[PDB]
Amino acid sequence: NVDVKSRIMDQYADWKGVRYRLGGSTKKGIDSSGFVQRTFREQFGLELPRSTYEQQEMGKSVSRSNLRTGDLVLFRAGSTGRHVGIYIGNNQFVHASTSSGVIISSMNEPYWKKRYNEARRVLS
Numbered sequence: 001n002v003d004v005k006s007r008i009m010d011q012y013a014d015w016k017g018v019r020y021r022l023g024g025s026t027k028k029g030i031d032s033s034g035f036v037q038r039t040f041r042e043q044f045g046l047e048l049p050r051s052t053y054e055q056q057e058m059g060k061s062v063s064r065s066n067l068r069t070g071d072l073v074l075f076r077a078g079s080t081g082r083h084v085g086i087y088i089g090n091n092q093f094v095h096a097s098t099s100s101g102v103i104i105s106s107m108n109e110p111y112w113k114k115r116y117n118e119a120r121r122v123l124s
Contacts, residue, residue, distance in 0.1 A: 004070045004123065007043040008086055012094045015102045022079060032083045035096040036072060039086060046122065052082040059122035064107075070123040073107070075115040087119070 021029025025038065033052040040046040048055055056074050067073070069089045077083035078098045085095030091107045105112055 002044065004044075005088060008039065008070065008088055008094065011039045011043055012102065012104070017100075018096070018102045020096050020098050020101050030096050030102070032078060032085065032096045032098075035094075035102060036084050036086060040122070044123070048122070052080065052084050055084055056082065056118065056120060059120045062119045062121045064116070064119065067119055068121070070121075072120040072122060074117045074119065075112060076117055077112075077115050082117075083115075 015027065015035065018027050019029045020031060022031050024030045025034040030038070033050060033055055036055060037048045037050055040048050048058060055072060062071055067087050069087060071087045073085050073087050073093050075083045083095070085093035085105070087093050088104070092104055093107065094102070094104050096102050097105065107113065107116065
């Protein structure tokens with residue numbers, strides 16, 4: 001009974017442009033795993049682990065061709081080499097980017113295309 005796309009965009013609209021901060025988890029500064037953890041807690045009542053390393057072990061893996069809104073997409077980015085976002089369809093994803101804060105990006109940007117690693121499904 002959940003409009004998943006609407007709820008993810010609700011979170012994004014509440015967090016748009018919040019600055020990136022490695023280890024942060026407030027609107028004063030948040031990182032990529034932090035934003036994903038907070039989204040799924042507040043919008044879907046799910047408790048993901050805190051770190052990107054643990055988040056890529058959650059749920060089940062999905063191929064890039066089978067991506068669905070709400071899947072986690074993972075890239076080789078940021079100072080830890082592990083960077084996570086939330087797929088929202090149309091080849092787009094929301095994430096706390098290291099350079100620009102919470103933003104929408106596209107899987108088809110060369111920067112992200114060449115850094116894409118894998119994806120996880122945590123929503124039924």
